[PDB]
């Protein structure tokens, strides 16, 4: 790698020693031989260990603290990977596989509380890399614009339920900023920890927003991943919202291949995501739950779910690595109708 590259990598190193608050993944597990092991890499696309760790070493408060430049560099960079990927997940184990992508199948799934008693509001939400492409901190303004061109074409030649507009950031009118923003839809350039992993160079280009004409289906083009794709509507039925999900996922990918580790599963710009890169969740009101939390909580492990919280709640699938996207949606179905039965049971 470059001298200049070098340079900013030994003094982010000794920064990193030097500051002795710091509880970033990044300083835990950049040991001294592991640095010096992977120091010198590239990966074929370009990306060197500061295009991994620049974030964390200008933003010493990052909880984790390194990204990912390309899908190349979760093996070129393995040694630091791997280690804060399995501290992160909680249990990932060098040897560890992550199970084969399945949709499961989607005739065991049911509606959830269709008297709309609880639950107030269902999204299903995954990430896609596409094949061939670097990740945002390596991605060229041509390379941006080529891929909003595929992502737009792709996205604006589905039919039916899946029919809708493309909006490009670049060139967008305050009208349709405000519209946008009115429904939540609209996105824009992203924090300290985003900017410093040069997560948003050449800004707008290639950044865009898709939606359905029903506002239940969305699409970030090039925020965090190349692709942040969502399902979302009120009421409870997760089957009809994962449907959806699975529906256009597929008929993205039949003309826009994605990036996939036979370990890692689904390649995403943070370690963080991976796996399924699925996240399944219901804003549900559980008020009699509500005040005996623990019974709560014993469920939502029992179910591997996640509990954001009085009476409301936004409860979704704590993993994304070690288990399939049908595990994960049948979790929450699972888990969020033992809430219900629990929760009409109480006094």
């Known amino acids: 790698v470059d001298q200049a590259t070098l340079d900013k990598l030994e003094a982010g190193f000794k920064k990193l020693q030097e500051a002795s608050d710091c509880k970033s993944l990044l300083k835990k597990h950049l040991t001294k031989d592991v640095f010096d092991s992977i120091k010198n890499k590239k990966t074929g696309m370009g990306?060197?260990?500061?295009?991994?760790?620049?974030?964390?070493?200008?933003?010493?408060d990052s909880g984790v603290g390194i990204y990912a430049p390309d899908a190349e560099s979760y093996r070129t960079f393995g040694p630091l990977f791997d280690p804060i990927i399995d501290d992160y997940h909680g249990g990932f184990?060098?040897?560890?596989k992550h199970?084969?992508?399945?949709?499961?199948?989607?005739?065991?799934?049911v509606g959830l509380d269709p008297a709309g008693q609880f639950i107030i509001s269902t999204r299903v939400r995954c990430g896609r890399s596409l094949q061939g492409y670097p990740f945002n901190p390596c991605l060229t303004a041509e390379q941006y614009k080529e891929m909003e061109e595929k992502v737009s074409s792709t996205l604006s030649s589905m039919e039916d339920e899946l029919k809708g507009t493309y909006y490009p950031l670049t060139g967008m009118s305050k009208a349709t900023q405000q519209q946008l923003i009115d429904d939540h839809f609209l996105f824009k350039e992203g924090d300290r920890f985003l900017q410093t992993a040069n997560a948003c160079r050449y800004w707008p280009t290639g950044r865009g927003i898709f939606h359905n004409d029903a506002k239940t289906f969305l699409v970030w083009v090039n925020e965090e991943d190349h692709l942040r794709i969502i399902s979302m509507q009120k009421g409870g039925d997760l089957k009809t919202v994962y449907k959806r999900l699975v529906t256009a996922v597929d008929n993205i990918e039949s003309k826009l291949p994605f990036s996939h580790d036979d370990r890692f599963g689904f390649l995403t710009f943070c370690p963080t995501n991976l796996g399924t890169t699925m996240r399944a969740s219901v804003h549900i009101q559980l008020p009699k739950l509500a005040k005996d939390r623990k019974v709560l909580e014993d469920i939502a492990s029992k179910f591997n779910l996640q509990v954001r919280g009085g009476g409301?709640?936004?409860?979704?699938?704590?993993?994304?690595?070690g288990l399939t996207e049908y595990q994960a949606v049948r979790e929450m179905q699972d888990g969020i109708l033992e809430m219900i039965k629990m929760?009409?049971?109480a006094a």
């Open 47 to 60: 990306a060197t260990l500061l295009d991994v760790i620049q974030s964390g070493v200008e933003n010493l």
């Open 93 to 96: 184990k060098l040897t560890d």
């Open 99 to 109: 199970p084969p992508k399945q949709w499961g199948d989607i005739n065991t799934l």
């Open 312 to 321: 409301v709640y936004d409860i979704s699938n704590k993993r994304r690595l």
């Open 343 to 345: 929760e009409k049971a």
